[PDB]
Amino acid sequence: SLLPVPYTEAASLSTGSTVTIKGRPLACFLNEPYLQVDFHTEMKEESDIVFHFQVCFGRRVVMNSREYGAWKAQVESKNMPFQDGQEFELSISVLPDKYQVMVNGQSSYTFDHRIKPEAVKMVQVWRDISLTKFNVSYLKR
Amino acid sequence: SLLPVPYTEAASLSTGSTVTIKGRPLACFLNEPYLQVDFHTEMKEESDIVFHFQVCFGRRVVMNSREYGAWKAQVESKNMPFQDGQEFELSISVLPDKYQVMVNGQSSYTFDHRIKPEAVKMVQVWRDISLTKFNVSYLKR
């Protein structure tokens, strides 16, 4: 749809920042489309990832970090608030101790900070979705 | 690039048919982009899949069929002829007993027929690639 996918935006994050994403899977859940959101330390796609969020729609979510080129301890969730065939609204809030992921207004995942959110320089949203909205808030000191 | 992804084309297959695909991953291999090619029994995306071919670039390939809505026995390969950052040419030939997958001219995977190739009505190419060429040959009786 509207925004290009893969979608890359330079970004800064700190406590109080919110990343808002509205989009839709490109396939029915039987075909297992993916969604991935990565908070990177540089604009380069091969850079480290402070927060990796990967949905296999209808199946599972994995979260991780990639530090000095290497994936760390994977967190796997079977929580699946996403609905087959539907648009979703994803909010990722930067709290003092963790990221909180809201899906369609419902708290759905959290991930404790392994690297300070101030290390983030770029956000990438990609895999099997269309994207109609992407925002990073910048209202707090 | 040129062709829309996900890419869907109505198709018929029999012994001697070749499916030719030229494209490029949308991400470096460190980020594990995927490629998927599915030979479907109907135009509907939720229809059965006579041949499912899914590459996790740099990691593995899985092949399967989806019959009456259910995935069957997975075949997993660690053969990885695809090159990081490069365009690829994929050929899938319909032989009497199997599909043969050539990558950049090199025989790389085969998959014995579980359902007659004449059941195919549609081919879908999707996930994290751009596509510049897609062809199904129709020269044989």
Tell me how many degrees the CA angle A32-B76-A76 measures, rounded to the nearest 5.
Answer: 45
Angstroms from B83 CA to nearest CA on chain A? 16
Report the Cα–Cα distance between both ends of chain A, in Å, rounded: 34
Whose tokens are 């101790």? That residue is A97
CA atoms within 13 A on the CB side of B38: 25
> Do the Cβ atoms of A6 and B27 come within 8 Å?
yes
Residue type, B107: S
Give residue B12's domain range. 1-141
Chain-chain contact of A45 with B28 (C-beta, under 8 angstroms): yes
Which string of b and e fits B43-65 if b means at least 16 CB within 10 Å?
Answer: eebebbbbbbbbbbbbeebebbb
Alpha carbons within 13 A on the beta-carbon side of B83: 7
Contacts of A44 (CB under 8 A, 6+ apart): none
Alpha carbon separation from B25 to A9, A15, A60, A85 (Å, rounded): 20, 35, 24, 26
The technique by which this structure was obtained is X-ray
CA distance B132 to chain A (A): 17
CB-CB contact of A97 with A113 (8 Å): yes
Pairing of strands B60-67, B70-71: antiparallel
Contacts within 8 Å (CB) and 24+ apart, B54-60: B54/B127, B55/B82, B56/B32, B57/B25, B57/B29, B57/B32, B57/B33, B57/B82, B57/B84, B58/B29, B58/B30, B58/B32, B58/B82, B58/B84, B59/B32
SS3 for B105? Answer: coil
Nearest CB to A46; choose among B26, B30, B34? B30
Tell me how long chain B is. Answer: 141
* Closest chain B residue to A38, measured at CA: B31
When computed from its CA atoms, the radius of gyration of chain B, rounded to whole angstroms, is 14
Contact B2, B129 (CB under 8 A): no
Q: How near does any CA of chain B get to the CA of A90, in Å?
A: 21
Q: How many Å apart are CA B129 and CA A128, to the nearest integer?
A: 11
Give the resolution to one decimal, in Å: 1.6
> Using an 8 Å Cβ cutoff, are B1 and B119 in contact?
no
Separation of alpha carbons B113 and B99, rounded Å: 7
C-alpha distances in angstroms, B38 versus A42, A80, B76? 35, 25, 16
Look at chain A and report how many structural domains it folds into: 1
For residue A81, give the CATH number of its domain: 2.60.120.200
